[PDB]
Design an enzyme around this catalytic site. Structure first.
Site, PDB file in Angstrom:
ATOM      1  N   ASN A  64     -10.000  13.753   7.786  1.00  0.00           N
ATOM      2  CA  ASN A  64      -9.919  12.692   6.652  1.00  0.00           C
ATOM      3  C   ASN A  64      -9.391  13.218   5.447  1.00  0.00           C
ATOM      4  O   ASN A  64      -9.348  14.316   5.162  1.00  0.00           O
ATOM      5  CB  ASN A  64     -11.459  12.054   6.486  1.00  0.00           C
ATOM      6  CG  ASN A  64     -11.421  10.542   6.053  1.00  0.00           C
ATOM      7  OD1 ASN A  64     -12.260   9.954   5.905  1.00  0.00           O
ATOM      8  ND2 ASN A  64     -10.115  10.098   5.375  1.00  0.00           N
ATOM      9  N   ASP A 109      -9.760  16.597  -2.880  1.00  0.00           N
ATOM     10  CA  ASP A 109      -9.393  15.837  -1.852  1.00  0.00           C
ATOM     11  C   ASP A 109     -10.581  14.626  -1.972  1.00  0.00           C
ATOM     12  O   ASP A 109     -11.359  14.600  -2.803  1.00  0.00           O
ATOM     13  CB  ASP A 109      -9.298  16.379  -0.530  1.00  0.00           C
ATOM     14  CG  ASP A 109      -8.333  15.638   0.540  1.00  0.00           C
ATOM     15  OD1 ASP A 109      -8.315  14.290   0.311  1.00  0.00           O
ATOM     16  OD2 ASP A 109      -7.964  16.205   1.300  1.00  0.00           O
ATOM     17  N   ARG A 153      -2.017  17.143   1.355  1.00  0.00           N
ATOM     18  CA  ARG A 153      -3.385  16.750   1.732  1.00  0.00           C
ATOM     19  C   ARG A 153      -3.941  17.395   3.310  1.00  0.00           C
ATOM     20  O   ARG A 153      -3.066  17.197   4.085  1.00  0.00           O
ATOM     21  CB  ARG A 153      -3.618  15.126   2.117  1.00  0.00           C
ATOM     22  CG  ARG A 153      -4.684  14.512   3.213  1.00  0.00           C
ATOM     23  CD  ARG A 153      -4.506  13.011   3.169  1.00  0.00           C
ATOM     24  NE  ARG A 153      -5.366  12.662   4.083  1.00  0.00           N
ATOM     25  CZ  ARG A 153      -5.246  11.332   4.402  1.00  0.00           C
ATOM     26  NH1 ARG A 153      -4.645  10.401   3.504  1.00  0.00           N
ATOM     27  NH2 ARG A 153      -6.193  10.653   5.401  1.00  0.00           N
ATOM     28  N   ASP A 154      -4.868  18.033   3.273  1.00  0.00           N
ATOM     29  CA  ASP A 154      -5.085  18.781   4.462  1.00  0.00           C
ATOM     30  C   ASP A 154      -6.138  17.745   5.235  1.00  0.00           C
ATOM     31  O   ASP A 154      -7.236  17.990   4.785  1.00  0.00           O
ATOM     32  CB  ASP A 154      -5.801  20.003   4.490  1.00  0.00           C
ATOM     33  CG  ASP A 154      -6.127  20.672   5.832  1.00  0.00           C
ATOM     34  OD1 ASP A 154      -6.067  20.004   6.582  1.00  0.00           O
ATOM     35  OD2 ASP A 154      -6.254  21.919   5.834  1.00  0.00           O
ATOM     36  N   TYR A 175      -4.584   6.331  -3.277  1.00  0.00           N
ATOM     37  CA  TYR A 175      -3.627   7.295  -2.984  1.00  0.00           C
ATOM     38  C   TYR A 175      -3.351   7.667  -4.596  1.00  0.00           C
ATOM     39  O   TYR A 175      -3.234   6.767  -5.464  1.00  0.00           O
ATOM     40  CB  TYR A 175      -2.204   6.831  -2.294  1.00  0.00           C
ATOM     41  CG  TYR A 175      -2.364   7.012  -0.860  1.00  0.00           C
ATOM     42  CD1 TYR A 175      -3.742   7.299  -0.249  1.00  0.00           C
ATOM     43  CD2 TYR A 175      -1.243   7.104  -0.067  1.00  0.00           C
ATOM     44  CE1 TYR A 175      -3.720   7.660   1.101  1.00  0.00           C
ATOM     45  CE2 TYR A 175      -1.255   7.305   1.261  1.00  0.00           C
ATOM     46  CZ  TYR A 175      -2.502   7.630   1.845  1.00  0.00           C
ATOM     47  OH  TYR A 175      -2.673   7.935   3.253  1.00  0.00           O
ATOM     48  N   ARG A 210     -13.129   6.487  -2.190  1.00  0.00           N
ATOM     49  CA  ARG A 210     -11.924   6.370  -3.063  1.00  0.00           C
ATOM     50  C   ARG A 210     -12.180   5.331  -4.120  1.00  0.00           C
ATOM     51  O   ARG A 210     -11.592   4.606  -4.418  1.00  0.00           O
ATOM     52  CB  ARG A 210     -10.822   5.966  -2.192  1.00  0.00           C
ATOM     53  CG  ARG A 210     -10.342   6.647  -1.160  1.00  0.00           C
ATOM     54  CD  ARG A 210      -9.289   6.017  -0.364  1.00  0.00           C
ATOM     55  NE  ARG A 210      -8.625   7.074   0.898  1.00  0.00           N
ATOM     56  CZ  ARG A 210      -7.971   6.585   1.534  1.00  0.00           C
ATOM     57  NH1 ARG A 210      -7.263   5.444   1.656  1.00  0.00           N
ATOM     58  NH2 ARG A 210      -7.395   7.713   2.626  1.00  0.00           N
ATOM     59  N   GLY A 232      -9.628  20.844   5.082  1.00  0.00           N
ATOM     60  CA  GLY A 232      -9.624  21.207   3.635  1.00  0.00           C
ATOM     61  C   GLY A 232      -9.742  20.246   2.817  1.00  0.00           C
ATOM     62  O   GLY A 232      -9.062  19.153   2.601  1.00  0.00           O
ATOM     63  N   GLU A 283       0.043  16.957   4.833  1.00  0.00           N
ATOM     64  CA  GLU A 283       0.375  15.572   4.920  1.00  0.00           C
ATOM     65  C   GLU A 283       0.463  14.917   3.469  1.00  0.00           C
ATOM     66  O   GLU A 283      -0.110  15.371   2.742  1.00  0.00           O
ATOM     67  CB  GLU A 283      -0.929  14.859   5.868  1.00  0.00           C
ATOM     68  CG  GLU A 283      -0.583  14.440   7.130  1.00  0.00           C
ATOM     69  CD  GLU A 283      -1.691  14.732   8.321  1.00  0.00           C
ATOM     70  OE1 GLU A 283      -1.618  14.651   9.552  1.00  0.00           O
ATOM     71  OE2 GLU A 283      -2.617  15.119   7.559  1.00  0.00           O
ATOM     72  N   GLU A 284       1.405  14.081   3.696  1.00  0.00           N
ATOM     73  CA  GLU A 284       1.427  12.978   2.330  1.00  0.00           C
ATOM     74  C   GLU A 284       1.804  14.049   1.141  1.00  0.00           C
ATOM     75  O   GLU A 284       0.805  14.095   0.226  1.00  0.00           O
ATOM     76  CB  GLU A 284       0.573  11.968   2.311  1.00  0.00           C
ATOM     77  CG  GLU A 284       0.215  11.414   3.505  1.00  0.00           C
ATOM     78  CD  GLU A 284      -0.887  10.382   3.586  1.00  0.00           C
ATOM     79  OE1 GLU A 284      -2.000  10.710   2.619  1.00  0.00           O
ATOM     80  OE2 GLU A 284      -0.693   9.345   3.899  1.00  0.00           O
ATOM     81  N   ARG A 336       1.016  -1.181   0.040  1.00  0.00           N
ATOM     82  CA  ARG A 336       0.052  -0.032  -0.213  1.00  0.00           C
ATOM     83  C   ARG A 336       0.883   1.238  -0.163  1.00  0.00           C
ATOM     84  O   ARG A 336       2.173   0.947   0.228  1.00  0.00           O
ATOM     85  CB  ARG A 336      -1.113  -0.074   1.140  1.00  0.00           C
ATOM     86  CG  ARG A 336      -2.227  -0.432   0.883  1.00  0.00           C
ATOM     87  CD  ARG A 336      -3.438   0.659   1.614  1.00  0.00           C
ATOM     88  NE  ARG A 336      -3.240   1.748   1.022  1.00  0.00           N
ATOM     89  CZ  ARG A 336      -4.026   2.923   1.655  1.00  0.00           C
ATOM     90  NH1 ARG A 336      -4.926   2.691   2.479  1.00  0.00           N
ATOM     91  NH2 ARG A 336      -3.799   4.197   1.121  1.00  0.00           N
TER      92      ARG A 336
HETATM   93  C1  LIG Z   1       1.390   4.138   5.761  1.00  0.00           C
HETATM   94  O1  LIG Z   1       0.152   4.604   5.989  1.00  0.00           O
HETATM   95  C2  LIG Z   1      -0.646   5.501   5.511  1.00  0.00           C
HETATM   96  O2  LIG Z   1      -0.018   5.944   4.700  1.00  0.00           O
HETATM   97  C3  LIG Z   1      -2.007   5.610   6.007  1.00  0.00           C
HETATM   98  C4  LIG Z   1      -3.113   5.215   5.091  1.00  0.00           C
HETATM   99  C5  LIG Z   1      -4.248   5.940   5.664  1.00  0.00           C
HETATM  100  C6  LIG Z   1      -5.070   6.526   4.503  1.00  0.00           C
HETATM  101  O3  LIG Z   1      -5.432   7.335   4.429  1.00  0.00           O
HETATM  102  O4  LIG Z   1      -5.401   5.592   3.659  1.00  0.00           O
HETATM  103  N1  LIG Z   1      -3.945   6.857   6.550  1.00  0.00           N
HETATM  104  C7  LIG Z   1      -2.456   7.037   6.537  1.00  0.00           C
HETATM  105  C8  LIG Z   1      -1.858   7.336   8.032  1.00  0.00           C
HETATM  106  C9  LIG Z   1      -2.365   9.013   7.700  1.00  0.00           C
HETATM  107  C10 LIG Z   1      -2.034   9.478   9.225  1.00  0.00           C
HETATM  108  C11 LIG Z   1      -1.877  11.182   8.792  1.00  0.00           C
HETATM  109  C12 LIG Z   1      -2.949   9.321  10.221  1.00  0.00           C
HETATM  110  N2  LIG Z   1      -0.367   7.445   8.081  1.00  0.00           N
HETATM  111  C13 LIG Z   1       0.320   6.734   8.831  1.00  0.00           C
HETATM  112  C14 LIG Z   1       1.789   6.752   8.740  1.00  0.00           C
HETATM  113  O5  LIG Z   1      -0.355   5.830   9.691  1.00  0.00           O
END
Ligand SMILES: COC(=O)[C@@H]1C[C@H](C(=O)O)N[C@H]1[C@H](CC(C)C)NC(C)=O
Ligand SMILES: CC(=O)N[C@@H]1[C@@H](O)[C@H](O)[C@@H](CO)O[C@H]1O
Ligand SMILES: CC(=O)N[C@@H]1[C@@H](O)[C@H](O)[C@@H](CO)O[C@H]1O
Length: 387
Positions: free
Chosen positions: A265, A243, A211-212, A323, A289, A216, A195-196, A36
């Site tokens: 989320n 988003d 990603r907010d 993603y 998604r 957001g 984030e990410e 993933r």
């Molecule tokens: C590797 O895991 C992910 O990417 C997960 C995947 C999941 C999603 O949105 O599908 N949330 C991520 C989670 C989001 C955080 C900001 C709570 N990140 C971690 C490192 O646990």
């Protein structure tokens, strides 16, 4: 020599298929690892698929419970483009459950984060050896982009975040060179939560679309200057929200604040903000998604009223996505940088709970200066077969 972002983005008139691994379909009867949070990343001599293994095969009995994100059995692996992540062909970059990776023109830097929620640690690898470590600073899931970073003359900025994923958090932009820390800055600008981040580089500037996760539905953006090692942040002004989940598209967007309607989320995503040559990615569904589409939204980044003028469906709304992030072959022939992106096609839980696992396959596309016909690219696996 280190690579330098000297080219601009090629003109995006459509998207051609770049790579697909049909991992889940194949793993149905072969030793393919559960993964993933995948991405694609290139070296000067080859491009590869990347993802976070769950340390077990899809058919393996340990695949049960892989809906979890952070365990001690995960690792950032890379494998031959469009091939599936198998036990026998997957190369381990480093151990952990959150990562980023990029080549600076000489060699590759990879970052993996592991540990308990209140005490994670990042290990920065360069030329495949450990060089620098960074301990949590907010004691709450230190985490990174989940897609490739970008380098300029040896300097490779990476966006991290530590703290609550559902409110104010501590984001930092680290500036690495040869795996060593040159400097780091706390997040600035108007982006209220990061984030990410999905990033790309062009003409000595690095744009990250993130990603907010707390407020957001519009996506925050961080533009980084790799020479001065400084940055700023804002939100994609456009009313075309990207988003997910997210409320319906309005007629006016928000530039310096989060567009409301959904809280705590989201999904990792990306965009290419290049004036009129701007394209946005988004799931077709606003509630889940499902599906994926590209939308040409001229000046989205600065026009809070910009609407689509062209588009292309990548995944139908009746197929699962996930993603999505940006990457480019900074070492290809040519005069411009060819915008590319991948889309994680998630299978299994929570949407498909007949099975006890959660995995995905990959689809990737790069842009064409031609106006190519479109097609949709679903995972292709038949869940019933795993029963
Ligand atoms: C590797 O895991 C992910 O990417 C997960 C995947 C999941 C999603 O949105 O599908 N949330 C991520 C989670 C989001 C955080 C900001 C709570 N990140 C971690 C490192 O646990
Ligand atoms: C492949 C290439 O030309 N790389 C150059 C490098 O030689 C130069 O030292 C650096 C700073 O100007 O920018 C980059
Ligand atoms: C394949 C398998 O045995 N999976 C088990 C499931 O049967 C059990 O009900 C659950 C606990 O609720 O944990 C998992």
């Amino acid at each position: 020599d280190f690579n330098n972002l000297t080219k601009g983005l090629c003109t995006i008139n459509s998207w051609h298929i770049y790579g697909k691994d049909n991992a889940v379909r194949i793993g149905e009867d072969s030793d393919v690892l559960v993964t993933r949070e995948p991405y694609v990343s290139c070296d000067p001599d080859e491009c590869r698929f990347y993802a976070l293994s769950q340390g077990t095969t899809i058919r393996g009995k340990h695949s049960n419970g892989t809906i979890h994100d952070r365990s001690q059995y995960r690792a950032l692996i890379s494998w031959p483009l469009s091939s599936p992540p198998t036990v026998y062909n997957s190369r381990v970059e480093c151990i952990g459950w959150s990562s980023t990776s990029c080549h600076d023109g000489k060699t590759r830097m990879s970052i993996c984060i592991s540990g308990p929620n209140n005490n994670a640690s990042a290990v920065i690898w360069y030329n495949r050896r450990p060089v620098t470590e960074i301990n949590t600073w907010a004691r709450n899931i230190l985490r990174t982009q989940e897609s490739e970073c970008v380098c300029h003359n040896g300097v490779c900025p990476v966006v991290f975040t530590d703290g609550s994923a559902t409110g104010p958090a501590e984001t930092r932009i680290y500036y690495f060179k040869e795996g060593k820390i040159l400097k780091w800055e706390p997040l600035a600008g108007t982006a209220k939560h990061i984030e990410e981040c999905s990033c790309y580089g062009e003409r000595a500037e690095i744009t990250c679309t993130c990603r907010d996760n707390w407020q957001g539905s519009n996506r925050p953006v961080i533009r980084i200057d790799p020479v001065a090692m400084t940055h700023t942040s804002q939100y994609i002004c456009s009313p075309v929200l990207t988003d997910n989940p997210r409320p319906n598209d309005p007629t006016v967007g928000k530039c310096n604040d989060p567009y409301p309607g959904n809280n705590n989320n989201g999904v990792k995503g990306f965009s290419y903000l290049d004036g009129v040559n701007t394209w946005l990615g988004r799931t077709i569904s606003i509630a889940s998604r499902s599906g994926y589409e590209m939308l040409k939204v001229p000046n989205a980044l600065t026009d809070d009223k910009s609407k689509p003028t062209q588009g292309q469906t990548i995944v139908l709304n009746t197929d699962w996505s996930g993603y999505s992030g940006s990457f480019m072959d900074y070492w290809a022939e040519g005069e411009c940088y060819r915008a590319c992106f991948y889309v994680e096609l998630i299978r299994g839980r929570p949407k498909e709970d007949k099975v006890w696992w959660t995995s995905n396959s990959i689809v990737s596309m790069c842009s064409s200066t031609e106006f190519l016909g479109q097609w949709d690219w679903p995972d292709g696996a038949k869940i019933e077969y795993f029963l």
